[PDB]
Amino acid sequence: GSHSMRYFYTSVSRPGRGEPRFISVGYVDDTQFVRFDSDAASPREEPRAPWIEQEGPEYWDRNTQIYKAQAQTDRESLRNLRGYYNQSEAGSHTLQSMYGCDVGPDGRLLRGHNQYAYDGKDYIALNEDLRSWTAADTAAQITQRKWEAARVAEQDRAYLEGTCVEWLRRYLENGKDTLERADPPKTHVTHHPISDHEATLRCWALGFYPAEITLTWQRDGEDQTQDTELVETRPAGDRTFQKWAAVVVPSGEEQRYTCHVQHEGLPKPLTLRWEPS
Amino acid sequence: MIQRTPKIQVYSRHPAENGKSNFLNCYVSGFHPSDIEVDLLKNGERIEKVEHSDLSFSKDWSFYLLYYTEFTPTEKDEYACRVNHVTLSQPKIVKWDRDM
Amino acid sequence: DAKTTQPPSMDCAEGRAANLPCNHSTISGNEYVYWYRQIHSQGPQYIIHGLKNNETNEMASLIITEDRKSSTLILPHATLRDTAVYYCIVRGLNNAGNMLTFGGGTRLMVKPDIQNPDPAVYQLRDSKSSDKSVCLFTDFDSQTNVSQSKDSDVYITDKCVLDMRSMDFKSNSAVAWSNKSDFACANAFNNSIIPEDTFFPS
Amino acid sequence: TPQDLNTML
Amino acid sequence: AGVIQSPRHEVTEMGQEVTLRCKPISGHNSLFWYRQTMMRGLELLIYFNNNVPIDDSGMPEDRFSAKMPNASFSTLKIQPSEPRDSAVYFCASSLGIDAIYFGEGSWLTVVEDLKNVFPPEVAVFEPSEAEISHTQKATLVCLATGFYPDHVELSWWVNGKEVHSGVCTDPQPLKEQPALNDSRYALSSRLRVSATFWQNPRNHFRCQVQFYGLSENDEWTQDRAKPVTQIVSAEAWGRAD
């Protein structure tokens, strides 16, 4: 229920090396399935998940041509931005493209995205209506005028409303064995004494998919919005994810702390406590 | 230009038991720009043949990468991750805490 | 790539409305229907384009059916200038379908309504006068067919429409000639080309 | 599949 | 200002380099090179978007090279040129998803040998007295004959001014030897005026044919005059006969 598709482009200029580096990655939800690198010996789109490998040669050849044209155009766009900001030809710069579509459990489109950043900072975004541009500064407005004259918004909208949703539903069908299954987190609590009167309680959620998860700690019955250290979700490396949350606790009151885990694969929201061995 | 320093995490794919094969992971995230140097070390020495994920970024435009390798932890071996980035005046070294 | 079908040819009366049909059963939602025309091998000229709703401008009207599977280009009062080849082309919104791929097109002949036909064959003397002459088959009604000679040594030109604006007068004409001194006008224009009542002097 | 565009800014 | 193309006409011997240039409508980001022959009708050669070659499958596999160094200039180069390359090459440009606009075209004829090139002869044929007495109108006929290739433009000049009313020129010339390759061409035109306008002996009529052929800077080793781009005319004066 409710899926998404995303393409991420990164272009880094290399003034000591002529042409820039272009990398593209494609994701269905939290599963990457394609990749492209302009630095390869023979740059082509490559598969990164099994359920995409069944596509025929025309798919790969067409997408490879797409990426090559995109890389050239991004080189020219980086030179354009350098001009816009009156920056020098010595430094290296980064242009990032983000586009994709979020659909619902039915299949209909819920939201589209098509935005761009320059040197890590927001540059220009296609608004939610898919017909208007929000620009960040004056150079972004130069680009906005260029794009309004070329009716770029309509092309973005044609992709987001049409090809994006169709191919996303195709991907969900051909990969439904994994893309629709929600791997629940294997959860456990753990206890390390820091000294003699304090202890750290760590709540562990491992091996879950998708990445979205909520971990909270609660003393007696009240949460810890200031005592709960949270590491950000990290990839296990097998397409599943991990997270933990820890609390400092006075020694001798380790049963007044409950850990609440909420995940899409959990039949109901779950609650654990230190099961001391 | 907005430059962001990376956050680092060193950890195993599966819970570590000594003498049984596993995967060592160094996850770098939240950094910008994309040029980053990441190495994995077994008792101070570089682990050769280490792979990394394809470059991707988050919704704040900051990049993330996962470097990983095959390894078999023992009781006495020390594992670490070395990270260098244009935001660091000195390369950071994060040791693998088995409990984190 | 080419996605449309059109009648190879079509006639129309001058001053009347020309309805040029087009079929594009396989059109997609984000694909536009464009109409161009070409005159005398000159550069193709944009006429009109549309998505779903009827469109009209200072050249034509475009009528797209409800199911968008076919359309019609409408010239309102077709003039003699509108004689040309008309291409109905589908054009998409991405790089794959951004270019025009030309199909057969429809060759539209705008024929004038000769109120008072006076079909005749006159003979014209050279101004240099080298004992060479030219046959002029003129003032026939637009419904006439001028054929090519079987001989490769006599030349007949195609039909040609002429507008004297000083008198709001329009006339057809074909031209024939030959160097063979045994050639008379009652040859080229005697190949079941002329009607019975053709004035034929000299 | 990626978008069959090469937008320039 | 539309799409600008050059050269408009080119007649050159085979085996040399042909360069066709195009200036798109300023502000446009998309450029197209199309080719037109009789066989094939209108074929896309190359599609550039933002100066990047997007589609070149229509490019011949050898001797043809397309180029866009900036958003306001594009070239198509043929080297070495061969007779099978003779065609009309159109350049088109477009702003975004707005309508595509075409240039006036570059008409290239690559001749197997410059010896086959000939300028036209022009002859005017005066109205028939039968037509004058039967219709009260008078049809002058102009014949251009013997030219190769078929790059000609015919016009009528009454009293030193070009006229368009009352004129009909054949859309395309015919072959004088329809079976022979390298056949020379003929073209006919008519100009109809009132019988009184023709009877006035001071009115002047001239048929003019502009012929595109060799350049003045082309080589020529033949005895006859160098068949260069020129204008050949015939004329006649009115009369009460």
Residue numbers in the entry:
A (entry chain A): 3 to 279
B (entry chain B): 0 to 99
C (entry chain E): 3 to 204
D (entry chain C): 1 to 9
E (entry chain D): 3 to 243
Task: Give the published text.
Recently, A subset of T cells that cross-recognized the TL9 epitope bound by B*81:01 or B*42:01 alleles was identified in HIV-infected people, despite the absence of one allele. To critically examine why T18A TCR can creatively bind to distinct antigen-presenting surfaces in different HLA contexts, we determined the structure of T18A and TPQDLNTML in the B*81:01 and B*42:01 complexes. T18A adapts a docking angle of 43° across the antigen-binding groove in both complexes, and no dramatic sliding of the TCR on the pMHC surface is found. Collectively, the unusual CDR3β docking of T18A on MHC component, but not the peptide, enabled the CDR3β to avoid the distinct conformation of TL9 peptide presented by B8101 and B4201 allele, which might contribute to the cross-reactive property of T18A.
